[PDB]
Design a protein around this nucleic acid. Sequence first.
DNA 1: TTTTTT
Length: 117
Amino acid sequence: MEEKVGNLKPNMESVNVTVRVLEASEARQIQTKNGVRTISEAIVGDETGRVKLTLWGKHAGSIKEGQVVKIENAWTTAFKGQVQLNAGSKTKIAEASEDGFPESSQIPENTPTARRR
DNA sequence: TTTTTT
């Protein structure tokens, strides 16, 4: 029930995927139209590409460094034309152990993008 | 306390 990065699409209220940490920034406060929240940004991806991860509130800076994680049902929002991934409440992040997920130095950087008419 | 920024 989990899709890959090279097969993900924006505007989805549900996105399940397994990837590795490519980067991680400390948690900072942002100013929205609904007030102030605490979020952070961390780069992840797998052998199918790469997608920017956006943690929300407690997930902010709560993640680890290049380690095997498992993204859950979150969502995707297209910023500036490029798809993006986030992690909030219905999303549960946790370390996952497999047969050895691809390293960050061997993880593609292909940016997923839906097809336009 | 799903909004973020290029």
